[PDB]
Write a protein that binds this DNA or RNA. Structure first.
Ligand SMILES: NC[C@H](Oc1noc2ccc(-c3ccccc3Cl)cc12)c1ccccc1
Ligand SMILES: [Cl-]
Ligand SMILES: [Mn+2]
Ligand SMILES: [Mn+2]
Lengths: 483, 189, 481, 189
DNA sequence: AGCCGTAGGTACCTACGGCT
DNA sequence: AGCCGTAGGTACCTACGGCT
């Protein structure tokens, strides 16, 4: 037992590492669109009551809390993950609301974690909604001292909405973000027809929708990626040609491809010009400002053909760039290449499970409460005898037993009565009990209706999705040109 | 590690010396990139009233400012080579931002005195309180501190130059006892 | 606008200088702490990071402190916290560390991510009674929290752990001392306001370094305690011993305070290499956790080992001085203080702490007695109580009727309305009565204490003596005549 | 970065390669400095099965191990010049410690194969309950992992060298598909 | 000289896969 | 190429006073 064969060691050690990176680091879960680190951050913000109504917390406190309770890795891993969730040029639907320098398109990092502050965005409440109603399974944290969610309720389709990118071991994932109104329309369409095809779903979901806008060239790359989960999609900057006077022209770029560093793209153009690999450029300036948005200007030599220069720039610089779609996510605790319809089907299955479990928990909680009110009413109807029983009893134990035998109360009912405070004996309280009881019986019935009919439950899912669509859905930003 | 502006006209250009790499980032987003340059400093910079000339001229921070200003130093100083007509000191509104500000003024006074005399040296006025530059948003740094329409600058005026020499020597020089006596006399603990 | 450069320099410098003196670099004479240390310990308290509870991740502790109390870099905070855990830096360590917390070789601690910390047992004594109105709270930097202005400091921590700080226009350098000796000194002063420095030194013989070693002579100690300034000569503990074949070696088992061991060895090695010292054939650090500090210097056969050793004292940190400069905050203002002054301010603090604790305890006992008198009334007239509540439509009406019908206060009425039914069992009834009876005796005891200055001062003595008996230990540094 | 031992007798000397600068400091206090040397590694080290010799030999970590071992590499390897007759791999008991261990063994396999064949290469076994090396006390590291009286080292034995080549090439080489197929096949495990 | 201890600090090796 | 994003990362500038 003190000797180890090198082949065995390599095989065991490697496979421990590889499997861990696939299931527990680099790939998102198809159900909520999250990687372990992101899930721990959001759950931490939840568990710290860092909601949108409450004010910002110091990043270092947020991060320290997360690394200690849920994420036993370096803080920079955590803080960088949290930063990207706050950037409107990385996240189509930002999950974190930042206070401070949270970075720019130039690949300027955020301010250090001691400078910055953060909370949930409003949409993030939708990812966490119902987490405390037995909707999702909790698990032990890394050290056994805490509980952490294995998946979030994810009341909107966050995998496709914000997209994912991860290098794992043995594969990677690259899923572009999408428009929320489109996604939800597609889930609705699918819910009404299990046999919907990719072509029909694409009547709702036309293509990715980058936070950074821009153009996509043609539907062919989109189509292949949604049918097979793999595809190349050509993203192009929004550029125009315009006059600058004395009969000279310039190209003006105001939107650039997703995940392209603006500063570095400019450098590449500058280098092309310097090394004479492009003809006709006289000047290159970044006129971007917080006031006017992205504005890059490329001056053209008098009488040069600006359209030819621009075509060259797309060919020779990140001004046009591809997004290689490779939709690998979490399907039952494993990395799986999935097409568009599969991603939506796993999402809708998760929603059905969430809403069913929510309904069941609410039903249990309502019946337990009814049960307590049935005892409280008995107690108030016999209050003198109740008090006298308690006064004659030496101990809690004795009082519990007497109350249970004399008035047919359960253990829980007896406990509730012994816990009653004296102010609950005022005159309106008897009627308050009766009020609450009558609504609760009504509520119980409504819940039971839902658990009885698959169709009623499914409509409830549709209704909640539609409400989310109306509150948060927005306009498409990326233009897909039939080029 | 300077972020220069577009315009080459020193007369309409401003360079902001900002405490801290973190505040640095914010000010580059917020600024007008046409007329406003940003030079971030790590933190405490050399005290030139206490260092040797060899050490001063070898110091990275100092070298970067000299290059950025373009005027040369000491004997070789030429006001007409100045690359900016506004050098704006922008530090945290706290006791360490204060210190950094004294360190910078000492440097200008001892090595580029005419820049003060010419009225090219300013102090920015970020919002007062507990929050430092590193914690502020880019747009808010613009609104309060960098925007010509709303910002409040202080121009640095030299008045009595004998009084200035004695002051710089007392506060920043190597004689601790004269510094300690100044503190005790003016302390208001 | 326009600002005169002289005015700006004067105002800006004085802003900085004042801050560094009263709010960064110098300890408070009352609890021995600088802002950063105070905030760390207070944080550990506020997180219930006590000795009975298991350790917390350093980064959580530090992130908490930086956010609530200390708006500075976390390296400032973490490094300060690290030192408080090192038994070669703190005569009485304030932090109990889990993980690599550094060594005498100037190895840093492990990163904040890896390490964990709580209070030591003695730190409980610095914090004890902080929540009984003993010390003044103040608003934190941003107005969102409360922080202590000073800690209760139930032992004399300034002199016990000492301090060193570079400020502006002044620095401070106070060596650590032995706790048993200090507390005996405070006791002697409490019995005699007019005690001299010489008499105090019958209790307090001199500094007592965590790292032991020797001090040469009483005369630097004497000057420092009388004036607050003084130079004190420290030496390593070294012996000459045979290694056989008629050869010898020097063995060092204790080195002076704040000397980096690895660095001191390199200095010796360099002296040997550059031929500036004669007779050394070998130099090894045989230090271990198991055998403790052990540095061996082999001597060339027939060379005089005593001469070599005397040379090493002349040319290496093997002998080192501690320049005493006892500057602390007294009343918020910086001040050079002698030993008697340090102890006088500490004893004043203790009297104030114990008096305020006694007054708080008294108010809290009387409030609680008052509530129990209402519960007793309610139990004595329970049927009427229930009748009055049932006749009332609302809480407000019940409150009013209970107050008018049983001559109860608002607080008493609220408490009765809050009482649960399970409080009417026999065992619960007896508890209320027994708590009242204990509380009346407690109140009486408290009143005795606030009535007699001598009794209160004796209480301070008694508590100090308890701490002396629990935490006092042996002198480590030998003062040679 | 090497903390070497006293004895120059390679037969009784051991060098521990410890994951992390933090864990490295701990093991220097805890060790027996007569017979035990310590060499800390920043983190993930170069995968030599994927990198070219120029990059390998320019790598600081690799250079330090080569110098420390004293045996030279590849063709020029001399077992007799080994400075330690125990090279012990000491990583965290977690998935990243596992990976570091694979990176190390790949390096020894491809550049110092005879060191394995001679039985000089071992794997330390720190306490497996969730904690990394950076969180242990010096005495703890000593008792469990470094003390010859109580420690359980595994000697790394090379058995079938054809099978070892294929293993190193499949897990650590450039061809992803072979790696992916291995993970899929053994994932149940 | 250069250390000491709280402050304003910092830049950059590595694995991993896909790009086609 | 080298970059995308989570992982195992880290050196070394300065101020300040008093001692050597
Ligand atoms: N779906 C076919 C194939 O699955 C796997 N490829 O590599 C794997 C590595 C591991 C596991 C696994 C098995 C069980 C437990 C934990 C793990 Cl992570 C499954 C796969 C695939 C092909 C292409 C892309 C993605 C996936
Ligand atoms: Cl002798
Ligand atoms: Mn600041
Ligand atoms: Mn680890």
């Amino acid at each position: 037992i003190n000797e180890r064969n090198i082949t065995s060691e390599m095989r065991e050690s490697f496979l421990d590492y590889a499997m861990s990176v696939i299931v527990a680091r680099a790939l998102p879960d198809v159900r909520d669109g999250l990687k372990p680190v992101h899930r721990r951050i959001l759950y931490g913000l939840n568990e710290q009551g860092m909601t949108p109504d409450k004010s910002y917390k110091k990043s270092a406190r947020i991060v320290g809390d997360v690394m200690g309770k849920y994420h036993p890795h370096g803080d920079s891993s955590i803080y960088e993950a949290m930063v990207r969730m706050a950037q409107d040029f990385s996240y189509r639907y930002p999950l974190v609301d930042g206070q401070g320098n949270f970075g720019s398109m130039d690949g300027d990092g955020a301010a250090a974690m001691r400078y910055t502050e953060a909370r949930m965005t409003k949409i993030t409440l939708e990812l966490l909604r119902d987490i405390n109603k037995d909707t999702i399974d909790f698990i032990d944290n890394y050290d056994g001292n805490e509980r952490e969610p294995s998946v979030l309720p994810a009341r909107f389709p966050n995998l496709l909405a914000n997209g994912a990118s991860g290098i794992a071991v043995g594969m990677a994932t690259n899923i572009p973000p999408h428009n929320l109104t489109e996604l939800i329309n597609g889930v609705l369409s699918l819910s009404k027809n299990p046999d919907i095809s990719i072509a029909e779903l694409m009547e709702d979901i036309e293509g990715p929708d980058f936070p950074t806008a821009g153009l996509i060239l043609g539907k062919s790359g989109i189509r292949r990626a949604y049918e097979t989960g793999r595809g190349s999609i050509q993203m192009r900057s929004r550029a125009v040609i315009e006059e600058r006077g004395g009969g000279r022209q310039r190209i003006v770029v105001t939107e650039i491809p997703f995940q392209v560093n603006k500063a570095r793209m400019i450098e590449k153009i500058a280098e092309l010009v310097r090394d004479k690999k492009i003809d006709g450029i006289t000047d290159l300036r970044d006129e971007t400002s917080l006031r006017t948005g992205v504005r890059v200007v490329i001056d053209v030599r008098k009488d040069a053909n600006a359209s030819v220069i621009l075509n060259n720039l797309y060919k020779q610089t990140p001004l046009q760039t591809s997004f290689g779609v490779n939709m690998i996510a979490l399907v039952n605790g494993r990395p799986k290449l999935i097409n568009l319809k599969e991603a939506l089907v796993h999402y809708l299955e998760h929603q059905k499970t969430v809403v069913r479990r929510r309904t069941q928990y609410n039903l249990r909680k309502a019946k337990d409460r009814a049960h307590i009110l049935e005892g409280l009413r008995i107690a108030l109807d016999h209050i003198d005898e109740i008090i006298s029983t308690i006064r004659e009893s030496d101990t809690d134990k004795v009082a519990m037993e007497s109350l249970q035998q004399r008035f047919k109360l359960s253990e829980k009912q007896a406990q509730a009565i012994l816990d009653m405070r004296l102010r609950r004996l005022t005159g309106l309280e008897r009627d308050k009990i009766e009020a609450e009881y009558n609504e609760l019986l009504n509520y119980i019935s409504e819940l039971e209706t839902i658990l009885a009919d698959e169709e009623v439950l499914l409509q409830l899912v549709r209704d909640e999705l539609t409400e989310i669509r109306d509150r948060f859905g927005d306009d498409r930003r990326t233009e897909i040109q039939l080029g | 590690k300077l972020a220069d502006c577009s315009s080459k006209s020193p007369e309409e250009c401003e360079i902001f010396l900002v405490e801290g790499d973190s505040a640095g980032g914010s000010t580059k987003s917020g600024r007008d990139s046409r007329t406003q340059a940003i030079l971030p400093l790590r933190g405490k910079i050399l005290n030139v009233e206490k260092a040797r000339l060899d050490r001063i001229l070898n110091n990275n921070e100092i070298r970067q400012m000299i290059t950025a200003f373009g005027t040369g130093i000491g004997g070789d100083f030429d006001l007409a080579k100045a690359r900016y007509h506004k050098i704006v000191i922008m530090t945290d509104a706290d006791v360490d931002g204060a210190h950094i500000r004294t360190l910078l003024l000492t440097f200008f006074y001892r090595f580029m005195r005419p820049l003060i005399e010419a009225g090219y040296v300013y102090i920015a006025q970020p919002p007062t309180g507990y929050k430092g530059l590193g914690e502020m948003n880019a747009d808010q740094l613009w609104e309060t501190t960098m925007n010509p329409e709303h910002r409040a600058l202080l121009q640095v005026k030299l008045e009595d130059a004998i009084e200035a020499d004695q002051t710089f020597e007392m506060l920043m020089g190597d004689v601790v006892e004269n510094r300690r006596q100044f503190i005790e006399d003016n302390a208001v603990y």
